[PDB]
Write a protein that binds this ligand. Sequence first.
Ligand SMILES: C[C@H](CO)OC[C@@H](C)OC[C@H](C)OC[C@@H](C)O
Length: 97
Amino acid sequence: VNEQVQAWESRRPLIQDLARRLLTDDEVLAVTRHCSRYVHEGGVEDLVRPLLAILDRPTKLLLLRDIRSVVAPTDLGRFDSMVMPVELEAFEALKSR
Ligand SMILES: C[C@H](CO)OC[C@@H](C)OC[C@H](C)OC[C@@H](C)O
């Protein structure tokens, strides 16, 4: 928790600032709550699943960059198993336009 909580507290201003430029305030509050819950209680699938439902456009996926920095080392493989296919689909969405 502690290193991840420290990483979150140091990156929260960037994450929240970018989130508010891309999402509604209610969605920013949801992202904030999911990130805080994860760093304090763990469970990386419970962080990613709701984020992928909120971050529903390629530009919104930019938020996952700084969020990955708060993911505990033992959770990174799962995070990437879930997010990497979504990054590729988003590139396809930008390309097919
Ligand atoms: C979607 C967004 C940009 O497409 O990147 C996703 C997110 C998981 O960041 C990837 C990772 C943190 O950085 C990869 C770079 C540093 O090579």
